[PDB]
Design a protein around this nucleic acid. Structure first.
Ligand code: SF4
Length: 361
DNA sequence: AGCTGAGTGATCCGGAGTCTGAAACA
DNA sequence: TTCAGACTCTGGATCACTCAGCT
């Protein structure tokens, strides 16, 4: 059949795209997180039409404002209190993200429906049910579309789905697979049958890589096509033609700091001027929605208390600071970005340990 | 035939950055 | 040197309305 042999052609190219970038884009496979299903639902709720860092910071502020009493799937937010809470404070809590009243009312309605139907607030059983019925039940909610449900299923329930976002569509069109021409998002009906038969781990990995490639090299305006490894196979090419010292685990400075997560590859950093940068997984104790796909491989947080009041006592790694990932990554040299990926760190925001809430940098 | 209707295109609930061009001045 | 909007940002829900559909 012509279909199956045509499946091999792009699947061979897809793994070729993964293999070529994996040399430069670092190494990353499925690393589990302890986030509950409701947490992932609220995360996909908050990441609609907004940049990733703002969406994550909004969820962090939401968690800090209404905390579960603490020091596996466990909710980090007293969702019952939020549902019982008045709309004004909830809207004020996430006002920094935007659409504060709209999203707050949608969240309150979601929680109210969850309480009214199927008893109390729990969605752990969604993992057991067959994927199609879970997808339909998730889509049944208002404020959720196809792409959000696909991302939830792929990242949380480990199904075989692929979110075709603006990053995915542009990359697929330009990179010899399928101008400023506005293309309607229907290439999924084209792309997915090609990718219907593929390894699950393959899909998750391909895309962590693509999200990264979309953000680093193949930006919408002025892509760094000179340093891009896939410039040879790029169809769009034919159309056109501060350093820090890292602190060991048992360093005396981290006595007040909490115990590091055993799974996190990152290590504690020293922000010299005295300030400390906490790794994202350690800062959040894992337990973050969407498998922690918000944060890069080497994304770290900052300590607001140590930033305002320095803890100063009077190997070397490079940290690139900026407002967002795409801004700093615009590099005319490939070697610099490869080094920053394999042996570098990135920080964009700040965080406080006392109230566990995000603070401006 | 004279009423569907399917399907798309604007719009906006909203903050927060960057980017142009205009202006201005030489 | 200002600076005011014009865009983008892992999208959804409403309302209005041009091309097919038909019988
Ligand atoms: S060569 Fe340029 S357009 Fe092609 S994939 Fe690389 S960055 Fe994108």
């Amino acid at each position: 059949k012509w279909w199956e042999e045509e499946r091999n052609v792009f699947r061979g190219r897809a793994d070729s795209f993964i293999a070529r970038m994996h040399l430069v884009q670092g190494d990353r496979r499925f690393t589990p997180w302890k986030g509950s299903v409701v947490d992932s639902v609220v995360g996909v709720f908050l990441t609609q039409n907004v940049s990733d860092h703002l969406s994550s910071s909004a969820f962090m502020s939401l968690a800090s404002q209404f905390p579960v009493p603490f020091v596996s799937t466990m909710d980090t937010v007293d969702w019952k209190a939020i549902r019982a809470a008045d709309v004004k404070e909830v809207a004020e809590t996430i006002k920094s993200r935007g659409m504060n009243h709209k999203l707050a009312e949608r969240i309150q309605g979601f929680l109210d429906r969850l309480v009214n139907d199927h008893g109390s607030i729990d969605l752990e059983w969604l993992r057991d049910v067959p994927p199609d019925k879970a997808k339909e039940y998730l889509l049944s909610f208002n404020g959720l579309g196809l792409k959000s449900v696909e991302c939830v299923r792929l990242l949380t329930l480990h199904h075989l789905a692929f979110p075709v976002n603006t990053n995915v569509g542009r990359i697929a069109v330009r990179l010899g697979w399928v101008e400023m021409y506005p293309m309607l998002e229907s290439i999924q009906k084209y792309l997915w049958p090609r990718l219907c038969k593929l390894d699950q781990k393959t899909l998750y990995e391909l895309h962590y890589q693509m999200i990264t490639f979309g953000k680093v090299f193949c930006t919408k305006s002025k892509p760094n096509c000179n340093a891009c490894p896939m410039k040879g196979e790029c169809r769009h090419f034919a159309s056109a033609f501060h350093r820090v010292y890292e602190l060991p685990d048992e360093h005396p400075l981290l006595a007040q700091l909490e115990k590091r997560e055993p799974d996190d590859p990152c290590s504690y950093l020293l922000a010299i001027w005295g300030t400390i940068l906490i790794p994202c997984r350690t800062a959040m104790r894992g337990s973050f929605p969407l498998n922690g796909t918000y944060f890069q491989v080497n994304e770290v947080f900052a300590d607001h208390a140590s930033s305002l009041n320095p803890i100063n006592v009077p190997p070397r790694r490079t940290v690139y600071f900026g407002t967002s990932v795409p801004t700093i990554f615009k590099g005319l040299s490939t070697e610099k970005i490869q080094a920053c990926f394999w042996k570098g760190y990135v920080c964009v925001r700040g965080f406080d340990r006392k109230t566990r809430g995000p603070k401006p940098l």
